[PDB]
Design brief:
This protein has a single domain, classed as Rossmann fold. It is built from five helices and eleven strands. The chain has a seven-stranded mixed sheet with strand order 2-1-3-4-11-10-9. Strands 5-8 form a two-stranded antiparallel sheet. It has a two-stranded antiparallel sheet with strand order 6-7. A hairpin with a 2-residue loop joins strand 10 and strand 11. Helix 1 packs across helix 5. The longest helix is centred in the last third of the chain and has 13 residues. It is globular and about 40 Å long. It starts with a strand and ends with a helix. Catalyzes the hydrolysis of glutamine to glutamate and ammonia as part of the biosynthesis of pyridoxal 5'-phosphate. The resulting ammonia molecule is channeled to the active site of PdxS.
């Protein structure tokens, strides 16, 4: 099992380690050629617009849209997978959801708390500039995690989107394993 992690820019040693702990092989996807030979792709990150621009600039945008790869989008990845955010920006438009960016505001740096994952249990999630699901556009979109009235985790077939950064907590590997076992295998 080879799990690719999008990092056109940035360091993904944390994501790679979590993938290894989950029991899989990790692969850094920096350029379009790296997408070959992977079983799934994880799209992490903080600020979504910069990543959207990088995907287009280096061609990963159209390549991903042209693939049938299972994808786990975390934070920036949740935004990118969506079909709308209310603001004009580059999106993959794959998952049947719209997203509300900076759902918890921009005055607080971060927050950490246990999140109940559907059919799994509690996972420690680190939220930094976290977006949340707004509209759900399809009957096959499944809510897998909530934080109060906010939807912080959804699944649609081979796609999964989360508000927090799994790689920032010791529970990261559990989340990655949950994604692979339910969206890839």
């Amino acid at each position: 099992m080879i799990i690719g992690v999008l990092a056109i820019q940035g360091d993904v040693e944390e994501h790679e380690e979590a993938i290894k702990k989950a029991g899989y092989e990790a692969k850094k996807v920096k350029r379009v050629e790296d997408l070959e030979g992977i079983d799934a792709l994880i799209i992490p990150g903080g600020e979504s617009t910069a990543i959207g621009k990088l995907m287009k600039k280096y061609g990963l945008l159209e390549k991903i849209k042209n693939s049938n790869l299972p994808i786990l989008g975390t934070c920036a990845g949740m935004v990118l997978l969506s079909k709308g955010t209310g603001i004009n920006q580059i999106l993959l438009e794959l998952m049947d959801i719209t997203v509300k960016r900076n759902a918890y505001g921009r005055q607080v740096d971060s927050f950490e708390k246990e999140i109940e994952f559907k059919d799994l249990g509690k996972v420690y999630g680190v939220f930094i500039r976290a977006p949340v699901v707004d509209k759900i556009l399809s009957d096959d979109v499944e809510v897998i995690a909530r934080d109060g009235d906010k939807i912080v985790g959804v699944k649609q077939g081979k796609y999964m989107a989360l508000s927090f950064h799994p790689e920032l907590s010791e529970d990261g590997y559990k989340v990655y394993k949950y994604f692979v076992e339910n969206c890839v295998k």
